[PDB]
Amino acid sequence: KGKLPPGPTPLPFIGNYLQLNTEQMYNSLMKISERYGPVFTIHLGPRRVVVLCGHDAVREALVDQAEEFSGRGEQATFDWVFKGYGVVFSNGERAKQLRRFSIATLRDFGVGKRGIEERIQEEAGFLIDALRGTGGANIDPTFFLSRTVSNVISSIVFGDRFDYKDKEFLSLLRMMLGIFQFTSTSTGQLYEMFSSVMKHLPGPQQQAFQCLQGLEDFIAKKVEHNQRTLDPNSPRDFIDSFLIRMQEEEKNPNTEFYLKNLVMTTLQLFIGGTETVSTTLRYGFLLLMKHPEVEAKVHEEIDRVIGKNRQPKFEDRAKMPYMEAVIHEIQRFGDVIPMSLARRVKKDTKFRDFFLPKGTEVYPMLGSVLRDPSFFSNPQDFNPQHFLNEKGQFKKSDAFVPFSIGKRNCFGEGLARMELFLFFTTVMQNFRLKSSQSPKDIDVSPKHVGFATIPRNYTMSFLPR
Numbered sequence: 001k002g003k004l005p006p007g008p009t010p011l012p013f014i015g016n017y018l019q020l021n022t023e024q025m026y027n028s029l030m031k032i033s034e035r036y037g038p039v040f041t042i043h044l045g046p047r048r049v050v051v052l053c054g055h056d057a058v059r060e061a062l063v064d065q066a067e068e069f070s071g072r073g074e075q076a077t078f079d080w081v082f083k084g085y086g087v088v089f090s091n092g093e094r095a096k097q098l099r100r101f102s103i104a105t106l107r108d109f110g111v112g113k114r115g116i117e118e119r120i121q122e123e124a125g126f127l128i129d130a131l132r133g134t135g136g137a138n139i140d141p142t143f144f145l146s147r148t149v150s151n152v153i154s155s156i157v158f159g160d161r162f163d164y165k166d167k168e169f170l171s172l173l174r175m176m177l178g179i180f181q182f183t184s185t186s187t188g189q190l191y192e193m194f195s196s197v198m199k200h201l202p203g204p205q206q207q208a209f210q211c212l213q214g215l216e217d218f219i220a221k222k223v224e225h226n227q228r229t230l231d232p233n234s235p236r237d238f239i240d241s242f243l244i245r246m247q248e249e250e251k252n253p254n255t256e257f258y259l260k261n262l263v264m265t266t267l268q269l270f271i272g273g274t275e276t277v278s279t280t281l282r283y284g285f286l287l288l289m290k291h292p293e294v295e296a297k298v299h300e301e302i303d304r305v306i307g308k309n310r311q312p313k314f315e316d317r318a319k320m321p322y323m324e325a326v327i328h329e330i331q332r333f334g335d336v337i338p339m340s341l342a343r344r345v346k347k348d349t350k351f352r353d354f355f356l357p358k359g360t361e362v363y364p365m366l367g368s369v370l371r372d373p374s375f376f377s378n379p380q381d382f383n384p385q386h387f388l389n390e391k392g393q394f395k396k397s398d399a400f401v402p403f404s405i406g407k408r409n410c411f412g413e414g415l416a417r418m419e420l421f422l423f424f425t426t427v428m429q430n431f432r433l434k435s436s437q438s439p440k441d442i443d444v445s446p447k448h449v450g451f452a453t454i455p456r457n458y459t460m461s462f463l464p465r
C-alpha cells in the first residue's frame with residue numbers, strides 16, 4: 001500500500017499532544033494501539049514517530065530489518081548536552097567509528113573476562129562491608145547500591161574506583177538519579193515534545209541541564225588531568241586509550257576522534273553503566289521483600305551451590321537456574337527503559353506493507369515486549385516461573401529484551417549481567433531482607449514511567465544470615 005502507518009490526526013505543532021498523557025506515555029501509546037494496531041504513527045509535538053508494540057513487531061524491525069532500523073533517534077533532554085556527539089546519540093560514520101572503538105576498549109580493560117570479574121567481586125566485597133556497616137538499621141539503599149555499581153564502570157574509564165565517602169562522588173550520583181527521574185516525570189516527557197521552546201524557559205528542565213552540565217564539567221576535568229599525565233604506550237583507562245587514538249588521528253581532518261566525542265562518550269558510559277544497573281538492583285530488592293517465598297528459594301540455591309564462605313563467581317550461574325530466572329524476572333518486571341532509546345530509519349523502508357521514509361523516528365516499546373501476553377502467562381505479576389520450565393530449569397524467552405535487540409543494541413549488556421548476578425547473589429548470600437512494612441502492603445508499582453521506570457522510595461534493613 002506504500003504508505004506511512006495510521007494514527008490519531010495531529011494538529012499543527014502540538015501534534016497528538018491532546019490524545020496523550022505526559023505522566024503516562026506508555027499507557028497512552030498502548031491505548032492508541034488498541035485502536036490502530038501494534039504499529040502506528042504518533043506525533044510528539046513536531047516529532048513524527050512510528051511506534052512498535054509487542055514482540056513480533058519489534059523483532060521484525062530491529063532484527064529482521066536491522067540495518068534499516070539501525071539509525072539512532074533522539075531523546076531531547078540528553079541531546080541538550082550531547083548534541084549528537086558521543087557513541088550513544090551519534091549516527092552514521094561517527095557512530096560506526098565510536099561504537100567499534102568502545103567495545104574493543106572495553107574488552108581490553110577486562111569486560112567479559114577475569115579482570116572485570118575480579119573487579120566486580122572486589123566491589124561486591126565493599127558493598128557487603130558497607131551493608132554490615134549499617135548494623136541492621138533500616139536505611140535507604142539507593143546510594144549504597146549506585147556507589148557500588150558506579151565504581152565498576154568508573155574503574156574502566158577513570159582508571160580507579162571512588163571512595164564511598166567521597167562527597168563529590170555522592171554529588172555525581174545525585175545528578176544521575178535526578179536526571180533519570182526527571183526524564184520519567186510528565187514534564188520530562190512534555191519536554192520530549194516541546195524542547196524547541198521549553199529549553200529556553202524556566203522550570204524543572206533547567207535543573208536537569210544543570211545536572212548534565214555538572215557531569216560534563218566533571219568529565220572535562222578528568223580528561224584534562226589524564227591529558228597531562230599521559231603515557232602514550234601505557235594507557236591507564238578508557239580515556240587514555242581514546243587520547244592515544246586522538247594523537248594518532250591528528251593529521252586526519254575527517255577523524256571522529258576528537259575531544260568532544262571523548263568527553264561525551266565517557267559521560268555516556270558513566271551515566272549508562274550506572275543508573276540503569278542501580279535502578280534494576282533497587283527494584284529487585286523491593287520485589288524480593290514483597291515475595292518472601294522467592295527470597296527463600298534463592299537462599300536454598302545459594303547455600304547449596306556456593307555455601308557461606310567463598311565469594312560467588314560468575315560461572316556459578318550455570319548451576320543456579322532459579323537465581324537466573326529471578327534476575328530475568330526482575331529485569332522483565334522492572335522494565336527499566338520502557339521505550340528503549342529511539343531508533344530512526346537509515347533509509348526509505350517498506351515494513352509490513354507500510355512506508356517509512358528516511359529519517360523517521362522509531363519507538364521500540366520494549367515494555368510491550370517484556371509483557372507480551374503471548375510469551376508470558378501472567379505478565380502483570382512478579383513470577384520467576386516465567387523463566388523456568390516444569391523441572392525448574394532455566395527457560396529463555398524471545399520476548400526478553402531489556403537490553404533491546406538489533407544493530408544499536410546495548411553493548412554494555414555483558415558487564416550489566418555479570419554485575420547483576422554478582423551483586424544480587426553476593427548480597428543474598430550474606431543477608432536476608434527485612435522490609436519496613438508487611439509484604440502484602442508493599443507497593444511494587446512504579447513512581448514514574450517515562451524514559452525510565454522508577455520504583456517507589458523505600459527503606460529496608462539487611463540482617464546478617
Ligand code: HEM
Nearest residue numbers: 088272273276277337340341402403404408409410412416
Ligand atoms: C541492567 C542495565 C542496562 C539496561 C536495561 C540497558 C539498556 C539499554 C537500552 C534499552 C539501550 C538501547 C538499545 C537500542 O538502541 O536498541 C541501551 C544502550 C546502550 N547501553 Fe545499556 N543498559 C544497561 C546497562 C549498560 C551498561 C552497564 C553500559 C555500559 C558499559 C551500557 C551501555 C550502553 C550504551 C553505550 C548504549 C548505546 C549503544 C549504541 O548506540 O550503539 N548499558 N542500553
